[PDB]
Amino acid sequence: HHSSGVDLGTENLYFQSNAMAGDVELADRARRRACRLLRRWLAETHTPVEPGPLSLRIGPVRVSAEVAYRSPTGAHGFGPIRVLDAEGVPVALADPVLLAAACSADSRSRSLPSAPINAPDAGTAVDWVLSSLADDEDDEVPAGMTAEEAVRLLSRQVDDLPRSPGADPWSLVAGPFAAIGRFGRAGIADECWLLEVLAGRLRAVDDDLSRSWLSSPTLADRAVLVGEGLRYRPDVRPVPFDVPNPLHEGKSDVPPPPVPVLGGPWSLRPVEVAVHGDGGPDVALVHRWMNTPHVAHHWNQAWPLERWREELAHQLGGEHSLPCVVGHEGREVAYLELYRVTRDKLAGCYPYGPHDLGVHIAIGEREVLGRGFGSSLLRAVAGALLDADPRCARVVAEPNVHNEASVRAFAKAGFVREREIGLPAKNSALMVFSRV
């Protein structure tokens, strides 16, 4: 009767409808995976998240979703994750493997070509995700759970952290904190309150690990999408990285960046923003420098003049960043930002000491310079900062691993490349100039 299809009876419709029943749950399962990946991408890239629209370039795709619930531990709750074309039209929903592809494309690109993540036998997060679709579905948190019972689970879990000398430091983030986020995202309890409770369970035992977890400004977590050392042989061989420690004070009495005094051919002074008019010649110099191509290619801050005026005034009015004009034998040639790490984005990336100072650098008169200037200046600045503040342990910097002139200039000046770090727009070599 039918040649291009099957002849239909009610029994056939019954069979197919009991199959299409479960598709709804299959839909939710993909949503949860994609939500997990995005949480990781944001965590491993130290991308700031706040409620409302989140908009994000990840590899080759514009990505956008509503942050319905912002989580203190990073367990954000998302609206539909959508893919956008160049002008904001949604073109797709971000399925788990679509994200795994965008992130793998983005990550492999963030790291250097010679990195392990880019070895031919290395595999990709796509392989990892594809391989795990049949894996066991973790129980989501029962919506009716009581905060009382939530604390009971957390206290029990906290007390089961390895009383062991060689024990995993990511245990705290991967065990208890993960639970806290699932509790908050489920609407079961406020995560700050749960964290406060966990601090209490940690204070009760003065174990070495317990006390450091209360005192360190960062904690160990494990990355699965961002990091030069990643492999996905079949599954992921994750790599450790530092995330902010929520159990640790949010401001301190650390004074602003000092104004160092440099040796040799170098002069240094803070920028001055005139309150009258368009800002003055210092604002003009930075604006001009920051819009030249060789600078803008790395800083990506080729803004209009008034935007730079407010930035410099903004920095100068605070305790974070100190913008400076550097001169070489009387000619003004470079711009610096010297900043307190404890108030910078870098503070969530490595175990900083309270007085750490960092530097951003741009040589603006590159129309003539690239002749040993940067490394000599960088060296002077580091020793000069260590002289200005004897409670500072390190001067640090975050050049893009691809910014090969900056990285080499930093190391010629005596910085040591400790590790790669994932930042929102780039992966950076954490260069460290250490005291004595």
Ligand X SMILES: CC(=O)SCCNC(=O)CCNC(=O)[C@H](O)C(C)(C)COP(=O)(O)OP(=O)(O)OC[C@H]1O[C@@H](n2cnc3c(N)ncnc32)[C@H](O)[C@@H]1OP(=O)(O)O
Write out the binding residues. Answer: 361, 363, 372, 374-375, 403, 406, 426
86 versus 436: smaller Cβ distance to a second copy: 86
Q: Which of 237, 288, 294, 320 binds ligand X (CB under 6 A)?
A: 294
Would strands 82-84 and 90-93 be described as parallel, antiparallel, or unpaired?
A: antiparallel
User: Which residue in 20, 143, 275, 436 binds a second copy (CB under 8 A)?
Assistant: 20
Rule CB under 8 A: choose which of 86, 143, 275, 436 binds a second copy.
86
CA–CA separation, 192 vs 177, rounded Å? 11
Smallest CA-to-CA distance from 179 within 152, 210, 144, 209 is with 152
CB closer to ligand X out of 90 and 263: 263
**Which partner, ligand X, Mg ion, a second copy, none, binds residue 83 by CB below 5 to 8 Å per kind?**
a second copy
416 makes contact with Mg ion (CB under 5 A): no
The smaller minimum CB distance to a second copy, of residues 105 and 405, is found at 105
Q: Whose CA is closest to 421, among 259, 130, 218?
A: 218
Among 157, 267, 375, 434, binds ligand X (CB under 6 A): 375
294 binds, among Mg ion, ligand X, a second copy, none (CB under 5 to 8 A by kind): ligand X
**Residues of each annotated binding site for acetyl-CoA:** 361, 363, 372, 374-375, 403, 406, 426
416, containing H or E segment: strand 416-422
Using the minimum distance from each CB to ligand X, give the nearer residue, 31 or 412: 412
- 218, 348 Cβ separation under 8 angstroms: yes
Smallest separation (angstroms) from a second copy to the CB of 89 = 8
- Tell me if 332 sits within 8 A of 285, measured CB to CB: yes
Verify binding: residue 330, a second copy, rule CB under 8 A: no
Do strands 394-397 and 357-363 pair parallel, antiparallel, or not at all (unpaired)?
Answer: parallel
What is each CA distance from 215 to 172, 206, 212, 271, 323, in whole angstroms?
14, 12, 5, 36, 31
β partners of residue 90: 84
Q: What span, in angstroms and rounded, lies between the C-alpha atoms of 34 and 27?
A: 11
Per-residue CA distances from 182 to 72, 138, 217 (Å): 11, 12, 23
Q: Is 179 in the site for ligand X (CB under 6 A)?
A: no
- Compute the distance between CA of residue 322 and CA of residue 328 in angstroms, rounded to an integer: 19
- Which positions lie near ligand X, rule CB under 6 A? 294-295, 298-299, 360-363, 366, 369-375, 397, 399, 403-406, 408-409, 412
- Which positions lie near a second copy, rule CB under 8 A? 2-6, 16, 19-20, 22-23, 26-27, 29-30, 51-52, 59-61, 66, 68-71, 79-80, 82-83, 85-86, 90-93, 95-98, 101-102, 105, 120, 126-127, 130-131, 133-134, 184, 191
